[PDB]
Design a protein around this ligand. Structure first.
Ligand SMILES: CN(CC#Cc1nc2c(N)ncnc2n1[C@@H]1O[C@H](CO)[C@@H](O)[C@H]1OP(=O)(O)O)C[C@H]1O[C@@H](n2cnc3c(N)ncnc32)[C@H](O)[C@@H]1O
Ligand SMILES: CN(CC#Cc1nc2c(N)ncnc2n1[C@@H]1O[C@H](CO)[C@@H](O)[C@H]1OP(=O)(O)O)C[C@H]1O[C@@H](n2cnc3c(N)ncnc32)[C@H](O)[C@@H]1O
Ligand SMILES: CN(CC#Cc1nc2c(N)ncnc2n1[C@@H]1O[C@H](CO)[C@@H](O)[C@H]1OP(=O)(O)O)C[C@H]1O[C@@H](n2cnc3c(N)ncnc32)[C@H](O)[C@@H]1O
Ligand SMILES: CN(CC#Cc1nc2c(N)ncnc2n1[C@@H]1O[C@H](CO)[C@@H](O)[C@H]1OP(=O)(O)O)C[C@H]1O[C@@H](n2cnc3c(N)ncnc32)[C@H](O)[C@@H]1O
Lengths: 261, 261, 261, 261
């Protein structure tokens, strides 16, 4: 099939990439970085996040593989030594695919712009204080004042979501999780405090009250949006598909990353 | 159909119960507290929890209704004024049923005993320090030392789980959530810290290392178990069925209970 | 004595200010906004913070008073109705003074710039990731990666510090408190997690490792510093002096602000 | 001077104890376990806590030393290899003493009983729910419902207090810190949430409202008190005196214990 390989850029990743292409060369495998069916990421989770967004418009025609040259990642969870063993099983085929849920973000102006996130999407204070109205399925849930909010995919719960006190969710759960960044809670302002886990079809809407500029981030892409009036969060109908070749369970990936490998 | 009504016991609850039975008397409705199809709880969530466990062996043949005489509850979410309106719609039928997931607990000795929880099941220090090995789908995940652990149903996440830093989960999500009670984390002991959200079929096993006595609780039932060697947690295959007669969404119930009614 | 009055600017604050000046006019009191001995703030804590920094170079020659026209504040803790009673006791004299500790921030370049904070001073990510080395009395304590850090005065612990999980400290304690903003903790990065309470003479130093630009804030003043190599935190030798005229204890101020007035 | 040595009891601690007594034998040093001036603890912090309470009635006539045979402790912070070097400097004298603050607990019945804590004193649910009124300097601050409360000395903030979210306090600060154990916070019940740091002379009083039985703990001593009506917490006037022979600063002890030795 068509394949391509992206690299962190350092000497170790570029050289493992050149060795896999060489191993791939002796097969019915064509390197193609326009319409690949297999996207291999060599580096870290950030390298994988770049690879995902590089091909977010062909998600249903692509299986992703992550190779970590540094420490173990959650998307780059195969080490370099098995790359030669990886070439072989990628060549024949015959491998199950694993699908993780994604988060859809809709940003409306006064036109709109949608985005797709693998880790999380965050909304932040543009310069002055951050006050937004939180609306859940068209019901006003709370008026939030603080540093910002974070809406996380299941696989993203080990990322920014974990640092904000969120729960770690197994990626087979089609859900999204909202966490607060340093909220005020006094006699004037009241927020729920706890992280909120939303299922499919539930729409969380963030609406400004005073300022209308915000720092909106989607994974590592962070741009300041102007003249916004709504940020809609929703479990996407699209999924990211991983090529699977042996059992590396999620809770084991959590154990190795946070307890001790 | 067969029905029965349980009461908190105070003057207000006993009298609303006697008025609903009177309203029920003028219908094709027989009061029966052995094999009811409709179980009405008058009082609070605790009164409802008692009503659930009173009939946990006929869960698939029962629809539950909760009436709160005091503050708003999450299971007792209809106020007394609509009880007369409640009698009518219960009499004809024609009402959708709502199903919430339950948590199954298995306790093994050296025989075994299983239990069913609507809120949560907790395991606690029997007197000396609490040390248990946490095993997820037969993999050793961590060695926990602290005050105890709490495994919560979705509808239970607003109860004890919320006080322990857990996330609030919408009850349509078939899952269970584990939270820590005051764990030690130093160079010797290491725990994940974050709450963990597990899907169906995932089995969390708690295994003792030193002492084998524990305070195990299931909802308000808390008994000390002796000579245990395993506590297994798992999303139950059974569900609790609620009689539904109008839209009182979960996130609104959360708003009214924690933000301001 | 010399006095001056600052106002939030709205109609209510400007008019209470004009009435106190009128009441002050019938006394041996001269309005002077260059070298006052009494600085009255009318509005909120933010109005008081502006009044403090407006006169931070004459702290030992000034007693501060706060009047809240809106909700109760921690520095603006007298309501408008007692302003006429306030005029009288300010005129005669004979009132004890209360002193709260301040936080000193030193920012070095490659010259230096020092600052004085009543609430807190925070250091934040300038655009890229935030990584700093934390040094306590010239010992390397930890390498922090996250959103930022917050060093709070005692009276500031109810402000930003409280939202970040810090402890509330009685202002008679000459100390400063450091809290983390969303830190990463995995096999690579390790931070203490808990808030740290430092006494007098203890110097906490923040040193960059990669980027050298930071968003440094001091109370509501937030400016981006360039080419920094050290941010030093230390309990200041200066104190803010409040004019006291009746007992409004701190823990009562906490109760009224966060429990219910 | 008079001295004595206590041991964890295992083979390693008993044998290091017998070697120090031998080294002590060749000096103007008399082993005396009734009125020692030097109390050496060999084992861990728990062994040291037992040694402190064994002599809490002669605190002002005793200097304490801790030797850790296992991992590094906060009171047992010298390793066995320097015990022979420890014998010499203990023999001559000429060493500064370090003093840490203690926490005084008063428990009243309907007579009273006072206690002294080096780490913390906790109050817990006796069997039924835990509800107490929190009173600060004779003002009603809050009505707490939850698992319990913990009042910690400065040196105790790295113990149970740290697991409950409290701040780490340098032991030169004469203070005490209160933290909550899993409190309920809804429209009915309201607690401050944040840890509270109290100075000298401040009296925190816990008063029951419904049940009057409680599990009160002081360090590792935990006994159930009956017919109580008040638990008073206060920074003690007594201090524990440590024999100091080189610089092992507190924040370094924190670094080595929680970051990495
Ligand atoms: C440049 N990164 C790429 C990546 C990744 C990333 N994704 C995940 C994930 N899904 N589960 C766990 N670990 C993850 N990683 C690691 O996390 C660190 C920060 O990159 C790195 O070790 C990553 O690892 P690797 O790239 O060094 O191999 C942007 C991301 O950073 C997250 N993020 C931002 N701010 C904070 C913060 N304050 N605290 C914690 N996380 C934060 C956020 O989610 C964003 O998408
Ligand atoms: C006697 N109760 C019955 C009930 C209920 C209960 N269930 C829920 C729920 N699912 N979502 C939210 N609120 C809930 N409620 C309320 O919670 C308080 C404590 O009953 C009361 O107001 C309840 O309300 P109502 O009875 O006064 O109307 C035992 C339960 O207490 C929980 N629990 C135990 N210890 C703690 C603690 N330390 N912190 C918080 N919750 C705790 C635990 O889950 C247990 O099953
Ligand atoms: C514009 N403010 C002025 C003030 C004041 C301020 N100081 C204090 C204080 N010492 N103890 C308690 N309450 C305080 N207040 C209130 O706090 C809210 C935010 O102003 C307002 O109600 C204040 O009240 P009043 O102005 O509406 O009357 C900047 C400050 O905001 C703090 N701050 C910034 N970001 C956050 C955040 N994410 N969460 C919580 N606090 C934050 C920070 O400390 C900064 O100095
Ligand atoms: C039997 N212990 C003796 C000791 C000591 C103790 N004191 C301190 C301290 N001041 N600073 C930091 N570390 C400390 N240690 C360690 O802490 C662990 C638990 O002993 C052990 O490693 C201790 O170490 P060492 O004995 O193995 O060498 C009772 C104490 O346990 C604390 N405690 C109780 N319950 C919990 C909990 N749920 N979480 C955390 N701490 C708890 C409480 O404070 C009590 O006085």
């Amino acid at each position: 099939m068509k394949y391509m390989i992206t690299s962190k850029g350092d000497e170790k990743s570029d050289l493992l990439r050149l060795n896999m292409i060489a191993g791939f060369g002796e097969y019915d495998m064509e390197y193609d970085d326009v319409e690949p069916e297999i996207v291999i990421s060599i580096g870290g989770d950030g390298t994988f996040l770049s690879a995902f967004h590089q091909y977010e418009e062909r998600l249903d025609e692509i299986a992703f593989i992550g190779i970590h040259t540094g420490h173990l990642g959650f998307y780059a969870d195969w080490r370099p030594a098995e790359a030669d063993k990886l070439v072989k099983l990628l060549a024949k085929g015959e491998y199950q695919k694993v699908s993780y849920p994604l988060l859809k973000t809709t940003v409306k102006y006064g036109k709109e712009a949608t985005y797709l996130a693998l880790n999380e999407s965050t909304v932040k204070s543009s310069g002055g204080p951050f006050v937004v109205d939180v609306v859940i399925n068209d019901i006003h849930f709370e008026r939030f004042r603080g540093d910002g909010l974070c809406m996380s995919t299941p696989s993203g719960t080990t990322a920014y979501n974990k640092s904000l006190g969120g729960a770690l969710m197994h990626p087979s759960i089609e859900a999204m999780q909202l966490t607060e960044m340093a909220s005020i809670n006094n006699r004037v302002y009241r927020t729920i405090g706890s992280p909120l886990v939303f299922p499919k079809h539930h729409v969380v809407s963030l609406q400004p009250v005073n300022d209308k500029d915000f720092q909106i981030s989607v994974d590592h892409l962070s741009i300041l949006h102007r003249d916004v009036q709504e940020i809609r969060y929703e479990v996407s109908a699209k999924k990211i598909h991983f090529a699977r070749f042996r059992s590396f369970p999620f809770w084991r990936r959590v154990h190795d990353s946070f307890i001790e490998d």
